[PDB]
Amino acid sequence: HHWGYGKHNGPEHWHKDFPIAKGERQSPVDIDTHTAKYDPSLKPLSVSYDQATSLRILNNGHAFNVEFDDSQDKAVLKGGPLDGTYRLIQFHFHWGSLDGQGSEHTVDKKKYAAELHLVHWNTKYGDFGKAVQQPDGLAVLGIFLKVGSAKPGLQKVVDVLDSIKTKGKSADFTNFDPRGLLPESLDYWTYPGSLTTPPLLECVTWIVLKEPISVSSEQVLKFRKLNFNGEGEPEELMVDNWRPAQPLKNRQIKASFK
Ligand SMILES: NS(=O)(=O)c1cc(C(=O)NCCO)c(SC2CCCCC2)cc1Cl
Ligand SMILES: [Zn+2]
């Protein structure tokens, strides 16, 4: 039946329902750090999350989303490679069954334990659903996670996961500050790509930070206790919910640094 990450419905099957899976600007990609060229014309990124209003956390059967009120200009991304203003709508993660895999992007073929995606939509198109129909509709800030020291700012998310164990469960999640998930440096790579989940639309400017954040083994172990299945169905741990790297094709990855 429906797409997922399992034995029979995972990434290698998605093209049959979503032929753009084999398109010309698919994500994620391996970032070859020696080939990415420093681009002096990029700007510092502007991440303005001071007025971010979180509302709720949802297990959607693929990952979990932390949702924001995007009905006004509050939490916005701009600058860097972007023109105009992009509003935060949600964040989620991809992660592995073991610490040696889980990220979607890779760096010189290195896999991180997990990757955080902060999803934003371009306010010139009025709403998220119109934005995903445009080549410059979305901007995703991607952040790698390695296992080491705990990330204090992640603990509020970790502790609510037992309340949204299974697909379709949600919980109130107000007053969460996403600034606590950022690394110290905003040095980044950028390229034109796609959603990494069906429908795989080619509507995303990717901005991938170079500096990972560190989370503890105990924090990532709580992610791995979530379930892909619904309540009362046989348990399928939510692990390995990442799409592998796709062909770069006719694209350049640009560096904001060096
Ligand atoms: N992994 S990613 O490329 O950052 C990305 C993921 C999703 C997303 O939440 N996917 C889960 C299955 O729908 C969404 S929202 C989703 C996709 C379009 C229709 C609305 C649901 C947007 C992005 Cl950019
Ligand atoms: Zn994602």
Side-chain angles (χ1 to χ4, degrees), residues 169-217:
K169 286 200 76 185
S170 66
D172 289 313
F173 201 70
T174 49
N175 302 288
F176 177 82
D177 182 355
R179 292 179 295 187
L181 298 178
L182 304 175
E184 163 178 340
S185 176
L186 293 177
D187 283 352
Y188 62 89
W189 297 281
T190 181
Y191 74 95
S194 75
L195 316 177
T196 73
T197 60
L200 302 170
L201 297 169
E202 293 181 331
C203 62
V204 181
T205 303
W206 280 92
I207 300 168
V208 178
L209 296 190
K210 171 173 180 174
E211 182 177 323
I213 57 166
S214 170
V215 303
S216 66
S217 70

Side-chain angles (χ1 to χ4, degrees), residues 136-247:
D136 60 350
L138 295 189
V140 183
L141 181 60
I143 299 178
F144 290 120
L145 282 60
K146 64 180 185 168
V147 176
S149 67
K151 193 74 166 167
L154 184 56
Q155 195 62 33
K156 170 115 180 254
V157 170
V158 167
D159 276 336
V160 72
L161 298 181
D162 56 17
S163 78
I164 60 146
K165 181 186 190 175
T166 50
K167 176 177 56 161
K169 286 200 76 185
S170 66
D172 289 313
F173 201 70
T174 49
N175 302 288
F176 177 82
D177 182 355
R179 292 179 295 187
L181 298 178
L182 304 175
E184 163 178 340
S185 176
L186 293 177
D187 283 352
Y188 62 89
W189 297 281
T190 181
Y191 74 95
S194 75
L195 316 177
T196 73
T197 60
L200 302 170
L201 297 169
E202 293 181 331
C203 62
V204 181
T205 303
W206 280 92
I207 300 168
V208 178
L209 296 190
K210 171 173 180 174
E211 182 177 323
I213 57 166
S214 170
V215 303
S216 66
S217 70
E218 292 91 347
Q219 290 178 318
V220 72
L221 282 163
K222 288 180 164 133
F223 282 30
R224 296 184 184 133
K225 292 185 181 181
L226 283 169
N227 284 181
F228 288 131
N229 52 285
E231 185 182 8
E233 289 172 359
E235 181 166 35
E236 245 83 354
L237 297 176
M238 188 179 273
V239 294
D240 296 316
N241 53 353
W242 53 274
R243 190 191 192 190
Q246 302 299 307

Side-chain angles (χ1 to χ4, degrees), residues 3 5 27-28 60-65 89-94 104-105 115-120 128-129 132 138-141 194-201 203-204 206 241:
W3 71 269
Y5 293 95
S27 291
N60 62 26
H62 303 292
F64 65 83
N65 293 338
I89 177 170
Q90 53 115 307
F91 68 78
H92 62 272
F93 301 82
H94 304 265
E104 294 204 306
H105 293 93
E115 187 171 332
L116 162 64
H117 292 160
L118 295 128
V119 180
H120 312 72
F128 179 91
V132 297
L138 295 189
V140 183
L141 181 60
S194 75
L195 316 177
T196 73
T197 60
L200 302 170
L201 297 169
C203 62
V204 181
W206 280 92
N241 53 353

